[model samples]
Target: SGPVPSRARVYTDVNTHRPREYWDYESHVVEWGNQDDYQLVRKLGRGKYSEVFEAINITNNEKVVVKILKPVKKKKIKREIKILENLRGGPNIITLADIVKDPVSRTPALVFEHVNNTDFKQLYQTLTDYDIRFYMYEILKALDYCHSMGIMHRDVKPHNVMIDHEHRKLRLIDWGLAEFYHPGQEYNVRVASRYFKGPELLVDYQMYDYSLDMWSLGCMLASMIFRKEPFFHGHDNYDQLVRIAKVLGTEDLYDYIDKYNIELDPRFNDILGRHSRKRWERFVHSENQHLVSPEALDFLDKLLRYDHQSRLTAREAMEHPYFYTV
Candidate 1:
């Protein structure tokens, strides 16, 4: 319930040095684009916040993605637009082509450059060890670039990472839950999805930063290498911590909470059983052992730490030996 006591392992509030205008989402003015310029081709998918469709740019006949947002506060709409604009042209970041609003109903939509993405469930199953290393490294570049600009992508998961395997292209998408970093400012722990939620979010530590993305990235990598859909499969928010503590150890969770002076919600007391740290080798099976290596396990160890401050930053993660030969 309290703020994190210290800075994350890297890139902590680097944006705080920039001018206020650079990170001020509240002050951003939206310039809605012409909605008639694009025509919907077909439905792509849907998310909690938006309905996505494949659309064609009428002028150029180019394929693009149209994300029609669900009814939400105007401030949230502005924040998402502002963050995307600020992060435009950053390495591997999704290109926000335009922002459009329907004139009839006043519904807002975002236009983005289209990526030929394969479903992660199918694609990840086909990846070799090298493929995992290469793609993860690419994702790290995007995270590091965004963090350098003072942004924390609260939502980092396989669903948001668009990969074009044939071209070896990767883009980090969905800035809806992203926020600018300000040192000592408390943030909403409810930003990330259940599977990818970091220990800080689950434990109600509000002063987390870019390091939170590393934890999510760790979850993604764990699933990829271990052939698990979600390495930490929890049924609910409180259970999410129990799932994490089961692997990272309960004692470390206690240490993290104590270090930050966090008061655990009483609900956790009954379900929080003592658990010893489980070794990465325990996850290795005949199907996934080929993807398992000492370097891979070591890299994962650094990112999945219970203490948010201890996790590797995006920049540091790319330098780990797991990607040396990748």
Candidate 2:
């Protein structure tokens, strides 16, 4: 595997020059003659729901990432499109240039500005404390913008973050699970990567918002700083919570758990009673001892808090004293 590049390596020109107005999806899709406008350069990747290809627009001779939905119901495609439309701008979010139809494959495709640099997961391997801080600041900056506009990027992960090499900007992509934030509304039943999820979502599966992002950010930050995933993986959701309990090792969850009256699985008690403070201190305090300034650690600690109400807000996070110094 290639050593992950630092946040300084991401290229930002494509995202910077993208037009500000709502892109005319219809026109661009048609301009390519409905199907023959772009050439597939290579296979970038595929997912359970979609396949992405690296393609070059023959008309403009420029590169793009083409996302084609696998054979699925129309509702699924519409949902994905809605999420993309919801997150249209900001330096840290992905820019959708156009939507195209694959004639031969007969699949609907999404066109995005191609990004270089490694994702957070791979980025963690060779990551330095400075690189982690830079990368996360950009991620949270984008989240702050989205939340300000009433958007929730339900899925915040290393794989979803794109890096550009030339201009050095991080881009958050893949809004397949994103939604608009509505005050007082019940949150979904936990829509996030297992290793980077919030405790509230795990406890009640409701009563959530941007805090979930904070949780993911914390995990991502820890991974970036320590070069490993913080949460242990369990065979199931109940087991997952146990992993969280074992790592954190405290049962004061009732303060937040009572708010939602969420019931815990029997396994929850196993790790709840044990205290892992010593372990946590040794982990972060050791690896990041020299570089993770006190302010950064303080903020990071709050992000992982079990209390939903006390979690860091995207806006508040930007105003943190640490960034002020930076």
Best by TM-score: 1
Please give the CA lDDT of all the candidate structures. 0.89, 0.66
TM-score of each: 0.97, 0.81
Off by over 4 Å in 2: 1-33, 71-73, 119-122, 230-235, 266-273, 276-280, 285-288
After superposing all C-alphas onto the true structure, candidate 1 shows an RMSD in angstroms of: 1.4
In candidate 2, what are the lDDT values of residues 1-326, reduced to their tens digit?
32111110112122234452322222222233265787888888779678888989888999888887775655556655655665767657788888778677677788888887565455555565566667667887898877655566777877888876346678888877775554445657658777776776667546466667777887776665554565456566666666666666555565455555566666666555655543445566465565566776777777777765677787777777767644
What TM-score number comes out for model 2? 0.81
Model 2 lDDT, residue 13, Cα: 27
Pick the lDDT winner. Answer: 1
Local distance difference test, candidate 1: 0.89
